Write a protein that binds this ligand. Structure first.
Ligand SMILES: NCCC(O)(P(=O)(O)O)P(=O)(O)O
Ligand SMILES: NCCC(O)(P(=O)(O)O)P(=O)(O)O
Ligand SMILES: NCCC(O)(P(=O)(O)O)P(=O)(O)O
Ligand SMILES: NCCC(O)(P(=O)(O)O)P(=O)(O)O
Ligand SMILES: NCCC(O)(P(=O)(O)O)P(=O)(O)O
Ligand SMILES: NCCC(O)(P(=O)(O)O)P(=O)(O)O
Ligand SMILES: [Co+2]
Ligand SMILES: [Co+2]
Ligand SMILES: [Co+2]
Ligand SMILES: [Co+2]
Ligand SMILES: [Co+2]
Ligand SMILES: [Co+2]
Ligand SMILES: [Co+2]
Ligand SMILES: [Co+2]
Ligand SMILES: [Co+2]
Ligand SMILES: [Co+2]
Ligand SMILES: [Co+2]
Ligand SMILES: [Co+2]
Ligand SMILES: [Co+2]
Ligand SMILES: [Co+2]
Ligand SMILES: [Co+2]
Ligand SMILES: [Co+2]
Ligand SMILES: [Co+2]
Ligand SMILES: [Co+2]
Ligand SMILES: [Co+2]
Ligand SMILES: [Co+2]
Ligand SMILES: [Co+2]
Ligand SMILES: [Co+2]
Ligand SMILES: [Co+2]
Ligand SMILES: [Co+2]
Lengths: 301, 300, 299, 299, 300, 301
């Protein structure tokens, strides 16, 4: 009878992150997208649960892969169960999510499998650059984002699309791709700027991780000296993190170079294109979508 | 250079795949196919898929057990780091599943794959929280984390077998076979980790004592009526730290030898060998097809 | 020559200078209102028990790796673990010698036996956290009777052996044993309780010090669907202790399951039994003890 | 119930199972050839002193952070520091209780006082390495008389208090005190010596274990132009201990200055004084002691 | 890009040089030159040379004292690492010496520079081996490691002074001045490290208690007849570890306050202020040239 | 009177390295060079002592800068006295060495000061590349060597030259430069190959340091994959060193690529040029020099 006990052990790390609160964008996008597609409540529920597992599982891996001590102000899962159990649960949960997607969807699965694997191709580059200290170009950065976060929006879109036109499809493609860039570029921006992100992750958590955000990329390829900046980055990699003053030192250089102003420029332009794409769909479709415009608006600053 | 980013993604897999396997996995498929006689191309695809699953499991396991060595060389996460290694490992499992789908469509797997993680879950859970499992829990965990690999390969080969009869006679016997093989190979593995000098050369001296896993020898003497305060506390000391000193490892070995607990493990393995030979025999006669390959695989 | 003595007793003189007090001496004064032991012998008993209690504090702080004691650095963060342990062990021997100096016979072989039970209790405490065993409620209570309640018992045994002739120390026994047992259980449960609730117990020991130690308070034990809490304690065992965020997570689970309420109910029941016990003794000795009842009101 | 006792005594039963022996019991047998104490009481004295000596080994190994004892892991690398210290302190109390069980009067207050001097000696030992003070030869010798020579004194005090009636335990005193003092000084100096020279003392404790501890052997003290040696000891204090290469460097300086020879000369002089002392006692008791002279030949 | 490798070499110097000095060093040279009146160009060269020496000394000292903060910002070796920082520091000292040679030729320096290291040697030696120095040893060490900087600048300015007389009257007085200035500034520095909240903002809370240096306050109360077992042992505990906890630092402060040992340091500083004003006075009259700048420099 | 005690404290770290044994090449080169120049015994003694201090001081810094636990089988100086005292003594000793050079030499000093500073320019690049993980080109590597080790030979040469022609000078320049490259390239080679270097420094000490030797440089810029090789190097930098198996893994890749064969090729060609330069001088001068040819021969394999 204690087969239930074994299941609880296996899914304990998953039940942890899924329990905090943490959500927002994911569920909102599915709801907003469905205000257009009008997919049955039962089918969107099956899609929601699968995407949630998929998203939460990648968070389990990401926090471990990025060595993040905090998620949503609480300890990250691998600081509760340890990295070994967390990774084991996460990998299992992904397979479980794929099985669920198989159960209500035909094949094509052979399209979702492909896109799920693209997510890993995206993570691969992100982790590769961080680990070996290679600064990517701005375009490589965008391509990486399209794969690791943009593809995540695409998956939820493809699922809802297959449960509902024709030309409308190649417009949602432009939507999810632009949306993916908005999310990540904001996420990297807010990590260094916002004080909520400071409370839900720690002060400049990305600088401990050593990820290459758009601000750093822009000023690294910006032709001036930066002997100091280059060396603290190396110092951080050698110590596995930075002190509060070191992070502040990085921010001040960023401020002095106005590289965050560039990031703000890209985000505003992205919102312009996304506004246009949304209205393009609302016109091409029956009626407008305040839910999608809300989500877009939640993504500025 | 679209080729470059895939190379980065699959670099940790190519590393572990470039090492000498020992080919236990491949030898079994070959032996099983001496009975089922599936065409070489279909067999090759199944071999490739299972090889990817197995190697990916080793990627994860070495990191999870914090093993410094794999086949005498540094473990994969001591090349690419934990993050990269885990990422491709999960990806490669997805990829293998995708490969399996392309030539099969059915039907157990993937589902049986989820049982692997169920087995690992218990293995990792006990080790992390220091809970000593019973012999039955130990066996059940092994059926899930190890025996299932064999089950996977069999089902794949079985579903690809010709209409040359029966798939009804064999299935009961084949399940008995893969399960017995799974137990013995893991029990042998946990046994050899402490006594074999080749394993010392491949994994380091008594690597499982660093990992802190619960092998049959330890389990047997702990649930004994004799007191083992020292033994219990060294194991806890090893988990508190990153592992054990050589003297701490040697101390455990002395306790084991003093109580001949490895001899109990030898007895269990021999008894499993007997049942294995019996099971192979029932099939060799029922199909009128002797299998020197399976009996040769047993030679371990 | 005094220098050698000052070096040996420096770690003791450190904790002894701390304000860590307010229960041990008040219990002796409260009990002596009954036993009416001469003030001089009460002084020696107070001194001896003070040395013992301080010595156990030296050991426990080291053994639980507590960084703070009464808001100041713990003794082994001043003198190191080696000097602290050596001084502590010496101080225990010194106290016993003092006890021997004013009491003989089976009184000594009773206190000696009683002191050894303290270590028996500490052993189970230390053994459980080190090997990651979650104790039952009964195991926990028995552990408390040995390591905490026995300290009260020592003080009473000393006082009773020096009691006035107008007092039947044979009728009174077992009633006093029932008292100290309840009192020690009430004190320790409150101690484990307060460590997770208060400040003091965040100002004096740091935030949730028991969770760094990996101590098994009554709240924690009552719970162990509780999978996440088991693992973080294990994570706390593998790491040097818990992060501020990890400790807060434990509190949330306790709060959600209202484990704080359970221990609160247990201590109120102990308050009831204690009042009933003091009453029986008050009738038996034909003497009211407002001090004991006053001491009881410490929650 | 036995389980609780087994847990408490597990760290003691660990060192007690080790072959760490060959001097303590031989001294008792040698001395008893003179004192002719009944075999039964000698047994209890042997048991009590054995518990004390083992308990001091538990503490010292932890306090000096020694990884190895008799080729096997030290006790605190089996049970952890907390359990080891608690058991050790308990075992000391237990032994004293045993001593109390067959001896009364000022005999106890003598052993109690003698045990406290052991801690006084350990205190100076621990205090010096922790605060980086290089002791003089006299300070070192006095430290030895307290922490080592006193152990012999305890055994003799017990045996003398149980001596046969045909023996004048008043004439004999001070001669025995002179003996134990010399013997303890000879034993400890040899102990500090052997730790840097031998194997055993590389097989039993690891290579130059005293240099990890930061112990002040007679060789080291005799030297402190010696600037480089001072700093590596400091480096050894800041780090967890010394590397294999660092220990070897210390040996080279010792060898170059022939510090090994000095301690060798000191111990030969101690051999002379010891023979003179045994002789005086042999005349005074009209009884030869080939055992003591046999025990003496341990170099 | 021959320019690039020099930029790499001087990058750690440019970092520390880009910070707000406080200009005590420059204020002294200006004040001294109100008397000696050396042309601006020759004064500028001397300022530049001394500035390089001083900054290079801070490069070395911050690493040697393992200080995490310098003027509120991370210390240089927490940017470029210990290796690079030390390399340019030694180089910059050579460079400064080369600069000094180009406009002088003589004559004390460099020689006086070697006394700086002699002072640092004792400072580092006592701290590393935990030896408590006497008040006299403490003063002598300070004359060498701090007072000599002032001596260097004076000799340079003195050798560049015009034939407008005397260089014989002043030298005795100027040596008395630079030496008094050196003691007071270091004693003030060690004082302010424990009590000034601005120093907490620039270096962290009680940084010297992390370094484990021997300030006058600690030295005074240690060589006292009262016992200080606790105080002594915390300091040793701090050296055993990387530094002290906040409670350990606060504990030391409480002992200091309880014994008013900082008041003794205040008395010494005031007495040095008195002698300084006296020495400035003897010179202001002997040259018939009052120096509001020197007296204003004293305001600290 | 205890002014001598303060001096002992200051020079204790210097007296340590100077005492072991460790020498060889330095004294041999000065003797071999003087078999030509015939400079008085008193003057060459003054030159020897100064160069020894200079060389030993740089070793004090180098071991600390490279985090080397061992020198000549014994603990490095900063593992006896600590990094702080070692660096303080080293810097002082360099200034002391400069003063000594000033005392027997005119100015031009203004030539020796310049060359001493070049040594630091060389070290600067070596430490910069190691710390920030930048692989230099082969020519940058050679230029760096000319500055940090080749210039050291040049200093001893300039000193002896100024105490003694005309055209002979611009031949010694080619000698010291070639000699500098021979020494360092061999030193980097022997670090990974020789078992004496394994005993006098530890197994593959350079792989812990993370320096960029010619073998690594050659195969890094050699166009093939090397995903594994690139990542262990990063792993080493993140851990502050490598395990025995990791170093062996690096050696095997080096072996597989025959990059050490290339290093052997460069060394043999260097010996060819050096043989030619030596004979060129022996002819241009009075008589041959077996001492210099010996030293050259001590530098192969
Ligand atoms: N997308 C989830 C992961 C992140 O967004 P998060 O900020 O860690 O949630 P990352 O910054 O790692 O890309
Ligand atoms: N189960 C595959 C991994 C093992 O067999 P391996 O010995 O690590 O290959 P484990 O002993 O960890 O179970
Ligand atoms: N028993 C006295 C020691 C304690 O009360 P304290 O918390 O150390 O005061 P514990 O809770 O550790 O038992
Ligand atoms: N005094 C018994 C303990 C010793 O002899 P040991 O070396 O621990 O046996 P020490 O040398 O530490 O004093
Ligand atoms: N002496 C210059 C450096 C100092 O003044 P600083 O306070 O570190 O600038 P120290 O206190 O180390 O002496
Ligand atoms: N030249 C002295 C320094 C070296 O040669 P060494 O091998 O450390 O002596 P490096 O390898 O650091 O260049
Ligand atoms: Co809707
Ligand atoms: Co992340
Ligand atoms: Co991430
Ligand atoms: Co992010
Ligand atoms: Co074929
Ligand atoms: Co494994
Ligand atoms: Co495993
Ligand atoms: Co295994
Ligand atoms: Co009263
Ligand atoms: Co406690
Ligand atoms: Co406790
Ligand atoms: Co408590
Ligand atoms: Co006998
Ligand atoms: Co010892
Ligand atoms: Co000792
Ligand atoms: Co010893
Ligand atoms: Co002007
Ligand atoms: Co400083
Ligand atoms: Co300083
Ligand atoms: Co300062
Ligand atoms: Co010659
Ligand atoms: Co080097
Ligand atoms: Co170097
Ligand atoms: Co080298």
């Amino acid at each position: 009878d204690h087969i239930f006990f074994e299941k609880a052990v296996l899914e304990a790390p998953y039940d942890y992150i899924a329990s905090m609160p943490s959500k927002g964008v994911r569920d909102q996008f599915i709801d907003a997208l469905n205000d257009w597609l009008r997919v049955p409540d039962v089918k969107v529920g099956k899609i929601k649960d699968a995407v949630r597992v998929l998203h939460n599982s990648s968070l389990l891996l990401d926090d471990f892969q990025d060595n993040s001590p905090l998620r949503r102000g609480k300890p990250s899962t691998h600081n509760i169960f340890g990295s070994a159990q967390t990774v084991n649960t996460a990998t299992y949960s992904i397979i479980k999510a794929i099985g669920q997607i198989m159960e209500f969807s035909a094949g094509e699965v052979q399209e979702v499998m492909n896109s799920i694997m693209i997510l890993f191709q995206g993570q691969a580059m992100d982790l590769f650059w961080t680990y070996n200290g290679h600064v990517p170009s701005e375009e490589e950065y965008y391509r990486m984002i399209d794969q690791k976060t943009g593809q995540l929006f695409s998956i939820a879109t493809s699922l809802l699309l297959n449960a509902a036109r024709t030309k409308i499809q190649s417009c949602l493609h432009r939507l999810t791709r632009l949306l993916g860039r908005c999310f990540q570029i904001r996420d990297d921006y807010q990590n260094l700027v916002s004080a909520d992100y400071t409370k839900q992750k720690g002060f400049c958590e990305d600088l401990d991780e050593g990820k290459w955000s758009l601000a750093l990329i822009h000023m690294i390829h910006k032709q001036r000296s930066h002997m100091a900046l280059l060396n603290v980055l190396s110092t951080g990699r050698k110590h596995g993190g930075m002190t509060l003053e070191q992070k502040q030192f990085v921010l001040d250089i960023i401020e002095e170079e106005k590289s965050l102003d560039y990031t703000r420029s890209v985000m505003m332009d992205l919102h312009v294109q996304l506004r246009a794409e949304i209205g393009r769909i609302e016109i091409l479709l029956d009626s407008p979508n305040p839910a999608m415009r809300l989500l877009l608006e939640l993504l500025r600053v």
